[PDB]
Amino acid sequence: MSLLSKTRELNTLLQKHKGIAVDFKDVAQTISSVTVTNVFIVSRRGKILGSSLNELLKSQRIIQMLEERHIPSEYTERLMEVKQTESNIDIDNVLTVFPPENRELFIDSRTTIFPILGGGERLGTLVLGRVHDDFNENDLVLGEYAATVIGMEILREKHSEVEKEARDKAAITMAINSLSYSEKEAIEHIFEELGGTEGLLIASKVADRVGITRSVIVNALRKLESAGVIESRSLGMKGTFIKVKKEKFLDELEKS
Amino acid sequence: MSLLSKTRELNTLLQKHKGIAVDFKDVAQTISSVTVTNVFIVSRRGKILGSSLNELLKSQRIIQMLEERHIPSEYTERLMEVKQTESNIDIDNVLTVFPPENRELFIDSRTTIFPILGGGERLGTLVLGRVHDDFNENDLVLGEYAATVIGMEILREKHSEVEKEARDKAAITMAINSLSYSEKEAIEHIFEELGGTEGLLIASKVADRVGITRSVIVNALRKLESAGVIESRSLGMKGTFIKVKKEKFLDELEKS
Amino acid sequence: MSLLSKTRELNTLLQKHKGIAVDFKDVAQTISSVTVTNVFIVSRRGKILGSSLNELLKSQRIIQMLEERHIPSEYTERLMEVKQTESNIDIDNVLTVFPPENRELFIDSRTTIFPILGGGERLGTLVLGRVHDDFNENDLVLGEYAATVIGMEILREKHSEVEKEARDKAAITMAINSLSYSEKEAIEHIFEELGGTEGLLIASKVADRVGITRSVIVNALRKLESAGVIESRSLGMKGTFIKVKKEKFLDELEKS
Amino acid sequence: MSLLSKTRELNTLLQKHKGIAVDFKDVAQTISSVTVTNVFIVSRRGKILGSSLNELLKSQRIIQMLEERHIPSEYTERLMEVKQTESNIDIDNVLTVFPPENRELFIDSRTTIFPILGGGERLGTLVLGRVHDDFNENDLVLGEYAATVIGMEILREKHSEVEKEARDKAAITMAINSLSYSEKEAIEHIFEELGGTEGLLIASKVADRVGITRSVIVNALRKLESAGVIESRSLGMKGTFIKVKKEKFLDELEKS
DNA sequence: GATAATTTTCAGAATTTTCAGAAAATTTAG
DNA sequence: GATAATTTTCAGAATTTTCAGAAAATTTAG
Ligand SMILES: Nc1nc2c(ncn2[C@@H]2O[C@H](COP(=O)(O)OP(=O)(O)OP(=O)(O)O)[C@@H](O)[C@H]2O)c(=O)[nH]1
Ligand SMILES: Nc1nc2c(ncn2[C@@H]2O[C@H](COP(=O)(O)OP(=O)(O)OP(=O)(O)O)[C@@H](O)[C@H]2O)c(=O)[nH]1
Ligand SMILES: Nc1nc2c(ncn2[C@@H]2O[C@H](COP(=O)(O)OP(=O)(O)OP(=O)(O)O)[C@@H](O)[C@H]2O)c(=O)[nH]1
Ligand SMILES: Nc1nc2c(ncn2[C@@H]2O[C@H](COP(=O)(O)OP(=O)(O)OP(=O)(O)O)[C@@H](O)[C@H]2O)c(=O)[nH]1
Ligand SMILES: CC[C@H](C)[C@H](N)C(=O)O
Ligand SMILES: CC[C@H](C)[C@H](N)C(=O)O
Ligand SMILES: CC[C@H](C)[C@H](N)C(=O)O
Ligand SMILES: CC[C@H](C)[C@H](N)C(=O)O
């Protein structure tokens, strides 16, 4: 099986995965097939995001490591020292992925470490190990496709979660500014009587006890409703039902 | 220059690009440098998302294509019928990326087509062109790997686009439900006289033409600001400035 | 000389330094006196912030390192691996501060590495080396006073520069919001004709060419003057003299 | 517990505190834990910046001191006369930190005084108290090193305080120069009727009492907002809300 | 000393704005 | 079907606000 067929095999997993997310465990399996290696996709903090082992599964430490979803904290930082792709690493090296204890079974073992880069920084590490054979250039080509692609699926993940928080801050800010002076004070006193995420209270009485017009309170709520900060429904004599959908709202209110 | 050298060059563009969006015009010329080819990155409908050419620029048609940001209609169809990679296409084949009229300069021209796939569907096509040298398998490895990542960035963009159009619909609806009856009527008329995405008008004047209280207009606008549907700016004696941040708002409002 | 007298010596340098800043070179000298060692105060990126060497000055690499204001980039990252105070490190170790080349002169050499911590993260490293003798606990007490104190003078420096940028953003924002719609457009057209940091222009003519009232322009400038964004003086027939004192102002204006 | 163990404990509080400001109440009890002492951190004028006591809390006077956040006037003087560290002070010496009346519980009490020095001047005093055990030299090493860092955090705070009062003066002056003659007159009267740091008043009413155009008042307030001297809030029919962010503004204005 | 050129100041109207409160509309329980 | 309890809607006045522009004030050159 030629390199083209191996690259074609890997590139097919990505071109046909439904959705946008790519399962790194699926990737780990594919990387093992076309190269016959034990695969480890670890984070910058060592969290195991993918794995496709066989010979290593035969070690006690490795089993307890897969359950921890982590790797030796000390060995995690040593992978950070590899800034370029270092291949063909024997068992007599510190960067070997195989247990130095069971050296007899892994005497001819060779280890290669690919760094995962994205957006201009370090994102993870892709460690591949073999029991005897060595790594050639055709293997480093396949491994660098993975690191470059994994870093892209991580760069998207980190970026998408930043966009989410950035929108919530805008939604809260977009709402806090649309409030009037009397409407900010109204919202402060309501969330006080409400106490929790959702509840039921009589807005009118809260308006009378505090000395704020009743329509000023209805006005503030409808603005927060428009901004997606809360959901509200009327219950007539029972009162007004409120369900906060953005918790950080109040915290940013007094801050204003 | 070995394949592992060309591969490392391409991956470097992707791992260090700032932000998240990868510019296809950068990819195209990067693909062109490492393979010594004329590069086209086109969509299903033949829009040139990115290109980096040299010899082809000595043809009249190629220039007007770049001006139109599109490729011929006839050619776009025949690219869709290419369901797999097809390399070393001669000048006399319809799938050739070189103008046949300039045969004196393109008689020994070879052109390979790489379908761009993402999420299991055809997103576009990556076309490479050479004047003399044929395409080896080490070239198909790059072109196929570049079409893969190109499909990944398109898959991602189309997803973020859909998420945004959905967040917008939600913003409009959430803001329309916040409007009372008289408030919902003012906005219909305010946005009628505005005539465009943004403008300046005298609200109190429009309030008297229809017979709605001016206070109604002020509160309604302030509720659309809470949902990020419009930006509003008071110019006192000169009127009110209104910039709409959601095209489809007015259309959606009329539905109700 | 007892430890109390050594601690008293060090604590005097800090209690009597005039001003708020503490010169790390002065510190380097004091740390060398009370312990008789070659002192290195390096950053997280290896930048030498202080030094008090003697025996090492006798090496060619060290001389070229002091001029670079840096240390071997590779050795800089290895110091990051020391998370706790590691002392009594022989020349046969990678973390030795002495040149492994001139091993014969530094055979009994012992090296100690103190990490500089502040605010909850790593800030630098304090490396001490000896030619023969070893380190005791009384030496680690003195070295940890230094690391803890150096980290405090660095935490203050980093914090003070953050407070400075945070105020400039507020000054610009505090000003951009106080501007009216017509006053923002006025400031946009003035900085256009101005071209550079400071210059001379006739505001009236700029007002007439663009179609904005002349007093609207005087009003915008006086607000920016109040916010410290610009300095302005009148020159009657010659025009108005403007000197921008905050460059990022305009960049944040169109962004609004 | 060795000195190097006690030292490492204190440094840990300083290296991991969040922000920049170190809370002296944390330092005091930390000093108390590692040396088994009653701790007082007082200024020149005897204000208890921080304390952590146990046995002393069984005395009436000590409690009222904590309530007053001050120490006796007579005792504060005698601490200033202590120009150097003085350890193992008996119960019958005026420099004792223990109430003589409770002699039955404090007859074998020992108390050491550590002057707190920063920038070459006396900033405060660190006082430690014990019921039985005397103070060794390993204790003077901690108390002297704690007084040093305490002096460092006071030196820093007093500097940031002065920089702020200077930035304020600049903000006031810069804002006053931005005011015209009629504008400068309105603010004098507006701030006269306000009577306090913040309040609500009817500007247009105050405009007619004096005979100034209402527009003048609006623009003047908007110029003080640009310099961060006040916050202003429009309440329409109810009036204008004004919060002053710079106490000394009104005073400084009257000077002109 | 005075003209000429901008630059500021000041005054005033039109519009925008926030709040009050009475009438309308709703929900819940009967 | 109807009372009672809040909840919304709507209308209206008082105040705040932004802009225009004419008169005043300033600087520069003579
Ligand atoms: N698409 C995709 N992304 C993944 C997968 N596994 C992990 N990630 C992403 O990888 C990113 C980093 O991994 P973390 O969950 O943060 O693990 P960690 O222990 O916190 O390590 P650090 O990210 O370095 O802090 C996360 O934001 C995930 O979105 C996966 O299987 N598929
Ligand atoms: N990252 C990135 N995406 C791009 C670039 N140019 C185009 N795209 C994406 O390519 C996709 C198609 O480009 P369009 O310009 O919309 O072309 P089209 O005619 O709509 O193409 P069809 O998808 O066939 O309908 C969209 O998802 C774009 O976001 C580029 O330079 N960078
Ligand atoms: N008080 C004081 N601070 C210093 C001294 N030398 C350096 N610093 C501070 O140490 C901080 C970090 O050093 P840098 O100038 O940033 O050196 P660098 O090469 O950029 O290394 P990094 O800070 O890790 O990025 C700076 O912000 C300085 O303010 C000194 O002699 N006295
Ligand atoms: N970091 C820090 N500084 C503090 C703390 N308590 C007081 N200070 C500083 O200690 C100094 C004096 O405290 P004050 O409360 O002003 O006492 P004082 O009576 O003015 O003292 P004198 O300086 O003698 O006039 C000031 O610079 C304060 O900022 C604290 O808990 N943490
Ligand atoms: C997978 C980690 C490997 C075994 C590494 N050599 C260690 O001992 O931690
Ligand atoms: C890019 C278009 C190519 C050259 C096509 N064969 C044509 O003749 O138009
Ligand atoms: C000061 C650096 C020392 C000599 C280190 N062992 C190196 O060789 O880089
Ligand atoms: C803290 C004050 C001490 C106890 C002082 N000697 C007194 O008697 O008041």
User: Does residue D123 sit in helix, strand or coil?
Assistant: strand
Nearest to C76 by CA among C113, C39, C131: C113
Strand order in the sheet with B240-244: B198-201, B240-244, B230-234
DSSP labels, D41-108: EEETT-BEEEEE-SGGGGSHHHHHHHHHTB--HHHHHHHHT--S-EEEE-TTSTT-SS-GGGHHHHTT
Helix/strand/coil percentages in chain D, nearest 5: 55, 20, 25
What contacts C195, CB < 8 A, 6 or more positions away? Answer: none
Q: Rounded CA gap, B81 and B75, in Å?
A: 10
Q: Which nucleotides of E are covered by protein (CB under 7 A)?
A: 4-22, 25-29
Nearest to A130 by CA among A102, A110, A144, A113: A110
Sign of CA dihedral A14, A18, A20, A22: negative
Joined together, the tokens standing for residue A184 give 């900010």
Quote the ligand 4 centre to D51 CA distance (angstroms). Answer: 13
Ligand 6 atom nearest to B71, measured from its CA:
1
Q: Rounded CA gap, B169 and C158, in Å?
A: 44
Residue B251, classified by CB atoms within 10 Å of its CB into exposed (0-12), middle (13-18) or buried (19+), is exposed
Work out whether strand A230-234 and strand A240-244 pair parallel, antiparallel, or are unpaired.
Answer: antiparallel
Distance of CA B26 to the CA centre of its chain: 15
Q: Biggest alpha carbon distance in chain D?
A: 78
In this structure, are residues C96 and C90 in contact, taking their beta carbons and an 8 Å threshold? yes
Q: Give resolution, Å, one decimal.
A: 3.0
- Which residue in the set D3, D20, D144 is minimally distant from C141, CB to CB? D3
Sign of CA dihedral A30, A32, A35, A40: positive
Q: Strand E proximity: list residues 185-224 of D with CB under 7 Å.
A: 212-216
Q: Rounded CA gap, D43 and D69, in Å?
A: 11
- Please tell me which residue of chain C has the smallest CA distance to D140: C4
Candidates C17, C140, C141, partner chain D, best to mutate (most D CBs within 10 A): C141
Q: Which residue is nearest to nucleotide F20 (CA to C1')?
A: C213
What contacts B74, CB < 8 A, 6 or more positions away? Answer: none
Q: Which nucleotide is nearest to A235 (CA to C1')?
A: E27
Quote the ligand 7 centre to C75 CA distance (angstroms). Answer: 7
Give the CA distances from residue C153 to residues C29, C44, C168, in Å, rounded to whole numbers and listed in that order: 17, 15, 23
In this structure, are residues D58 and D102 in contact, taking their beta carbons and an 8 Å threshold? yes
Q: How far apart are the first and last CA of chain A?
A: 65
Q: Which residue has the tokens 């005395």?
A: D59
Domain with CATH 1.10.10.10 in chain D: 170-255
Q: Which nucleotides of F are covered by protein (CB under 7 A)?
A: 4-22, 25-29
Q: Rounded CA gap, B12 and A172, in Å?
A: 39
**Domain boundaries A179-254, corresponding CATH code:** 1.10.10.10
At how many degrees (to 10) do helices B137-176 and A214-226 cross?
160
Nearest to B54 by CA among B41, B42, B37, B78: B37
Q: Rounded CA gap, C113 and A237, in Å?
A: 73
Q: Rounded CA gap, D19 and D22, in Å?
A: 8
Neighbouring chains of D at 3+ CB pairs within 8 Å?
A, C
Q: Rounded CA gap, C222 and D244, in Å?
A: 20
DSSP labels, chain B: --HHHHHHHHHHHHHH-SSSPPPHHHHHHHHHHHHT-EEEEEETT-BEEEEE-SGGGGSHHHHHHHHHTB--HHHHHHHHT--S-EEEE-TTSTT-SS-GGGHHHHTT-EEEEEEEEETTEEEEEEEEEESSPPP-HHHHHHHHHHHHHHHHHHHHHHHHHHHHHHHHHHHHHHHHTT--HHHHHHHHHHHHHH-SSEEEE-HHHHHHHHT--HHHHHHHHHHHHHTTSEEEEE-GGG-EEEEES-THHHHHHHH-
The H or E element spanning position A48 is strand A48-52
The H or E element spanning position A215 is helix A214-226
Domain with CATH 1.10.10.10 in chain A: 179-254
Q: Which residue has the tokens 């014990």?
A: D130
Range C86-91, long-range pairs (CB < 8 A, 24+ positions): C86/C112, C86/C113, C87/C112, C87/C113, C87/C135, C87/C139, C87/C140, C88/C112, C88/C134, C88/C135, C89/C113
> Domain D3-156 adopts which CATH fold?
Beta-Lactamase (3.30.450)
Write out the CATH class of domain C165-254. mainly alpha
Joined together, the tokens standing for residue C56 give 């090492």
What contacts D105, CB < 8 A, 6 or more positions away? Answer: D55, D58, D131
Q: Strand E proximity: list residues 159-198 of A with CB under 7 Å.
A: 180-183
Domain with CATH 3.30.450.40 in chain A: 3-161
In this structure, are residues B149 and B41 in contact, taking their beta carbons and an 8 Å threshold? no
Q: Rounded CA gap, B231 and A177, in Å?
A: 12
Cβ contacts below 8 Å, chain A against chain D, sum to 7
What contacts D161, CB < 8 A, 6 or more positions away? Answer: none
Give the CA distances from residue D27 to residues C142, D9, D55, D130, in Å, rounded to whole numbers and listed in that order: 20, 11, 18, 17
Domain with CATH 1.10.10.10 in chain C: 165-254
Q: Rounded CA gap, B79 and B115, in Å?
A: 8
What contacts C107, CB < 8 A, 6 or more positions away? Answer: C91
Residues of A in Cβ contact (< 8 Å) with D235: 180-182
Q: Which residues line ligand 3 (CB under 6 A)?
A: C 21-24, 43-45, 47, 49, 153-154, 157-158
Sign of CA dihedral A66, A68, A74, A80: positive
Q: What is the 3-state secondary structure (H, E, C) of B156-222?
A: HHHHHHHHHHHHHHHHHHHHHCCCCHHHHHHHHHHHHHHCCCEEEECHHHHHHHHCCCHHHHHHHHH
In this structure, are residues A183 and D236 in contact, taking their beta carbons and an 8 Å threshold? no
Q: Is the CB of C182 under 7 A from strand E?
A: no
In this structure, are residues D79 and D72 in contact, taking their beta carbons and an 8 Å threshold? no
Neighbouring chains of A at 3+ CB pairs within 8 Å?
B, C, D
Q: What is the CA radius of gyration of chain C?
A: 28
In this structure, are residues D18 and C120 in contact, taking their beta carbons and an 8 Å threshold? yes
- Please tell me which residue of chain A has the smallest CA distance to D231: A256
Q: Is the CB of D234 under 7 A from strand E?
A: yes
Q: Rounded CA gap, D233 and C95, in Å?
A: 62
- Which residue in the set B3, B224, B225 is minimally distant from A141, CB to CB? B3
Q: Biggest alpha carbon distance in chain B?
A: 78
In this structure, are residues A40 and A52 in contact, taking their beta carbons and an 8 Å threshold? no
Write out the CATH class of domain B170-255. mainly alpha
User: Which residue type is seen at C205?
Assistant: K
Quote the ligand 3 centre to D146 CA distance (angstroms). Answer: 24
Joined together, the tokens standing for residue A196 give 């929790």
Q: Is the CB of C202 under 7 A from strand E?
A: yes
- Please tell me which residue of chain B has the smallest CA distance to C183: B235
Q: How far in angstroms lies nucleotide E20's C1' from the CA of residue B169?
A: 35
Q: How many residues does chain B have?
A: 256
User: CB A161: neighbour CB atoms within 10 A?
Assistant: 10
Q: Which nucleotide is nearest to A203 (CA to C1')?
A: F6
* Domain A3-161 of CATH type 3.30.450.40: yes
> Could you give phi then psi for residue C144, rounded to 5 degrees?
-80, -30
Nearest to C46 by CA among C20, C69, C15: C69
In this structure, are residues C150 and C41 in contact, taking their beta carbons and an 8 Å threshold? yes
Give the CA distances from residue B55 to residues B59, B140, B142, in Å, rounded to whole numbers and listed in that order: 8, 21, 21
The verdict on a CB contact (< 8 Å) between B16 and A117 is yes
Q: DSSP secondary-structure letter at C84?
A: S
Q: How far in angstroms lies nucleotide F21's C1' from the CA of residue D180?
A: 18
In this structure, are residues D202 and D190 in contact, taking their beta carbons and an 8 Å threshold? no
Nearest to A253 by CA among A185, A163, A168: A185
User: Does residue D178 sit in helix, strand or coil?
Assistant: coil
Domain with CATH 3.30.450.40 in chain C: 3-156
Q: How many residues does chain A have?
A: 256
Ligand 4 atom nearest to D153, measured from its CA:
1
The verdict on a CB contact (< 8 Å) between A119 and B7 is no
From chain D, which residues contact A within 8 Å (Cβ)? Answer: 233-235, 238, 241
Residues of B in Cβ contact (< 8 Å) with A155: 20
Joined together, the tokens standing for residue A187 give 């919202």
CA neighbours closer than 13 Å in the CB half-sphere of residue A168: 13
Ligand 5 atom nearest to A74, measured from its CA:
9
At how many degrees (to 10) do helices D181-194 and D248-255 cross?
140
Nearest to B84 by CA among B150, B147, B158, B149: B147
To 5 degrees, how large is the angle CA A207–CA A212–CA A216? 95
